[PDB]
């Protein structure tokens, strides 16, 4: 039984949430923001990502060089990432270096220079990032998957944004973005590891007290996405490995089917030929794939957003003449979530998840990420007891009912990259989303 997550508020509406661990000597503190690329329009798409670069380019007090020195002197590091709905800025340090790190974070968020000289310098760095993500095949596949599934909608935009916007982002629009979105009621200061809650709340009162509140304070994790069945093919015969993602519209964070979708995802599970245990996994798809050498790997996912999600699978394969078999058998395993799953598969997957959801949290950064994600998507940290109860309530009837409305005979979003000549047209893939025998 893990220590309780303590939670306090400030007057502006900033949440402070902490989980102490007197067994470790380091602490991760940071700011989880309920804002990301989704909050941009088509004209300033890329702003959120751009700001993340400029946040470390110098403040009203410390210059870029001074900033570097300050963090180096603390001894730990700083890290940041921007997604579609969430921005994070955190600092891993020693126990007694926590007040320094909170001070640095408050400074880069509230009092960043955004000087025209630095904007112009980063404009080239970010331009180069456009031509180097091309190598990260999984990211390419998932960015195209969002682009097609949420065609011409805010969730369909990339985080980097288009080349055109990168050349036209001004300090004005940067300042406007962070003034509108980085408000206290959308921010959570999170501490995990060697932190005292009462100390963290004092530091928050010292550094984050002059944060603007938004005009209309909605609860944390408050959002209409219209999924498009569609495909993107990025054929490249020179690549040896095909990368394929297939997804349907999934579930949001607060869906009533949230846990049912996770259990269904665990029944299919993951596979990797490089891991020794993977040939012995219980998953039917895993057995088909390993026995027939159909793939190098597959990973089931159930990605959630505030008002929608994507549920599906990501496959990698060198077997270019049996891509048809791989996709065929994958979708036939999905069909069985509607037609055949019983207490056998469901209880097994629940057993695996009950542990998995706790296992994931194995260091201070993981714990801080968990607190921050849950507070910014649900508005609370869900205790392991509540999670154990919600998982226990998932029955085989629930999985079958969920699959029959979410998977069975539904439109998919499909992305293929690489030697995908063997991937059949949309209709033949989508026809595998039902069984004529049932």
């Amino acid at each position: 039984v893990s220590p309780k997550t303590r939670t306090s508020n400030l007057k502006n509406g900033l949440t402070i949430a902490s989980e102490s661990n007197p067994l470790v000597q380091t602490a991760t503190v940071g700011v989880w923001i309920d804002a990301g690329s989704r909050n941009e329009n088509a004209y300033n798409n890329g702003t959120a990502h751009f700001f993340e670069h400029l946040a470390f380019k110098g403040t009203d007090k410390r210059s870029q060089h001074q900033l570097e020195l300050d963090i180096e002197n603390m001894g730990g590091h700083l890290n940041a990432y921007t997604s579609r709905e969430s921005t994070v800025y955190y600092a891993k340090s020693f126990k007694d270096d926590v007040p320094k790190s909170v001070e640095i974070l408050a400074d880069i968020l509230q009092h960043s220079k955004l000087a025209e000289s630095a904007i112009d310098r980063e404009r080239e760095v970010i331009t180069r990032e456009l031509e180097e993500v091309n190598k990260q095949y999984e990211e390419v596949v998932f960015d195209h998957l969002h682009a097609t599934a949420f065609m011409n909608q805010p969730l369909g935009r990339t985080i980097l944004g288009p080349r055109e916007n990168i050349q036209t982002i001004t300090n004005t629009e940067l300042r406007k973005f962070i003034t509108e979105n980085y408000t206290a009621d959308r921010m959570v200061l999170v501490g995990a590891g060697a932190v005292d809650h009462d100390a963290l709340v004092e530091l928050a009162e010292k550094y984050f007290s002059h944060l603007p509140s938004s005009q209309s304070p909605v609860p944390l994790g408050t959002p209409i996405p219209n999924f498009v069945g569609s495909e993107v093919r990025l054929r490249d015969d020179t690549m040896p490995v095909a990368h394929i993602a297939i997804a349907v519209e999934g579930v949001s964070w607060t869906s009533e089917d949230y846990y049912t979708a996770l259990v269904a995802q665990a029944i299919i599970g993951n596979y990797d030929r490089a891991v020794g245990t993977s040939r012995h996994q219980g998953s039917r798809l895993s057995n088909i794939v390993s026995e027939n050498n159909l793939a190098n790997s597959f990973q089931s996912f159930s990605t959630s957003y505030s008002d929608t999600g994507l549920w599906g699978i990501y496959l990698t394969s060198e077997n270019t003449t049996q891509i048809d078999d791989l996709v065929h058998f994958t979708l036939k395993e999905w069909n069985r979530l509607s037609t055949s799953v019983s207490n056998l598969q469901v209880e097994r997957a629940k057993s695996q998840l009950k542990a998995g959801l706790l296992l994931s949290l194995d260091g201070t950064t993981y714990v801080a990420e968990d607190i921050g994600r849950q507070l910014t998507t649900l508005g609370r940290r869900v205790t392991p007891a509540e999670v154990e109860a919600k998982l226990e309530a998932v029955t085989e009837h629930d999985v079958r009912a969920w699959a029959q409305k979410t998977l069975y005979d539904k439109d998919i979003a499909l992305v293929g990259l690489g030697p995908i000549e063997g991937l059949y047209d949309y209709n033949r893939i989508r026809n595998d989303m039902s069984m004529m025998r049932w």
């Binding site: 495909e231 047209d425 949309y426 209709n427």
Partner: protein, 53 residues
Amino acid sequence: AFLTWAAEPEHDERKKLGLKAIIVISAMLGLSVYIKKFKWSPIKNRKFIYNPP
């Protein structure tokens, strides 16, 4: 008229069955056009973006 009947005594039945056939086959022709167009629309609607390597 009588000799025409003698040459083709199925005449009346044949034409009534023909009417039934015409109606069914026309309906099936219309539906086969809808179904073909439905299945073909992903091919017909396909778009490309080429970036020369």
